[PDB]
Design a protein around this ligand. Structure first.
Ligand SMILES: *[C@@H]1O[C@H](CO)[C@@H](O)[C@H](O)[C@H]1NC(C)=O
Lengths: 47, 48
């Protein structure tokens, strides 16, 4: 309904490569009253 | 042929209505996207 919602979690981990077996829940980070359609996304990385 | 614009000259001696008057219009748009401007929700002292 035009609101763009982000939820997020940070944790320390000590593991080689895979997504970890275990349970945790994302807290709400921020909610933005944007009002745009979104149908495609892209990611931004450091060189 | 005419230049399509004219300057006002406002000099402080002119009659009322011939004088310069600033104008501002708050035009606003409704409800097709999330409510993004509105007034202070007035609030009152806390009772228990
Ligand atoms: C989002 O998509 C719908 C369906 O095509 C359209 O009615 C709406 O106006 C679009 N929103 C914007 C901001 O273009």
């Amino acid at each position: 309904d035009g609101y763009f919602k982000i939820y997020s979690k940070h944790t320390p981990i000590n593991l080689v490569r895979d997504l970890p077996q275990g349970f945790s829940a994302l807290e709400p980070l921020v909610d933005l009253p944007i009002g745009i359609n979104i149908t495609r996304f892209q990611t931004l990385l450091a060189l | 042929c005419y230049f399509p614009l004219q300057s006002y000259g406002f000099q402080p001696t002119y009659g009322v209505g011939y004088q310069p008057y600033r104008v501002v219009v708050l035009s606003f748009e409704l409800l097709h996207a999330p409510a993004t401007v509105c007034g202070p929700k007035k609030s009152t002292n806390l009772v228990k």
